[PDB]
Design a protein around this ligand. Sequence first.
Ligand SMILES: [Zn+2]
Ligand SMILES: [Zn+2]
Lengths: 151, 151
Amino acid sequence: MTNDIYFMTLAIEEAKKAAQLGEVPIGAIITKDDEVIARAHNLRETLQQPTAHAEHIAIERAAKVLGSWRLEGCTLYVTLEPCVMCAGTIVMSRIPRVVYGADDPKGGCSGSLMNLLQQSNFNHRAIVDKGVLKEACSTLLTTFFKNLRAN
Amino acid sequence: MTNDIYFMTLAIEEAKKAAQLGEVPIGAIITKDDEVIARAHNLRETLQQPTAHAEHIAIERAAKVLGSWRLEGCTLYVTLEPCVMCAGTIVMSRIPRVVYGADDPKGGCSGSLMNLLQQSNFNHRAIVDKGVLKEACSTLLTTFFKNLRAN
RNA sequence: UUGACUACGGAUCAA
RNA sequence: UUGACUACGGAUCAA
Ligand SMILES: [Zn+2]
Ligand SMILES: [Zn+2]
């Protein structure tokens, strides 16, 4: 029983809310000192905003809470591997650590298609840990799309 | 080309607004049907939001007016080559064409360090044109950082 | 520590 | 068209 696992379950809770809203089931949690400072879930379809991915929303919420665009000492937990946009957002908010669940072989940019969080040419790189509760994180997606298609 | 200068002119004017606020002088304009539907300038320091880059703000404003996260038929004009975050946001909002002024040798991800807008593995790619009013776009930055250091 | 720097220069980079 | 698909499946990909 670890914090990483604990916080990921909280991210899965966010992913479930998204599923209840009819959105792709992806959730995110941001911590500082092992204290939740922000949480979010996918709201792209609900708000019709291209940036409404879970990580992106969480990052802006944490920035407001901390009073600065620099999220120093923060850790981001997300159920799915960050896409090109979120990976870049992580770089620009300078989050030092990212823990994610399932990999995204189709659009993942934190290890799959590329790792934008580990670029020597960027002014910031982040520690990247994957697999945390990936089975459960992955199940939410496959279930969602199964139903999406059936319907 | 002349149309491009017209809109980049408005992006520079927007960039100057950011300058007056003490922000890195970058501005953006989004058009649809040859009409301006959104404009914005850098607000990172003012709002203390890591996502407050000009094109990112313009994209969310564009999405709001269109009531859709898909920016079909839109053209983005920005005074500086989009960074990793903005390039990714451009991909996630599915903008068909991007026109930028000055190149960013240090962080540009639309041709310089890489081109996230021409990724074979992504579900979206855009036409990228560079150099429009390159000189004017570049000067703003050169001046900003010269004064910043002296400051 | 000095220098460089095109998204602050609180980052990064070179000695 | 027809299928596949892990950020809608309005995209992309494959025949
Ligand atoms: Zn994302
Ligand atoms: Zn940017």
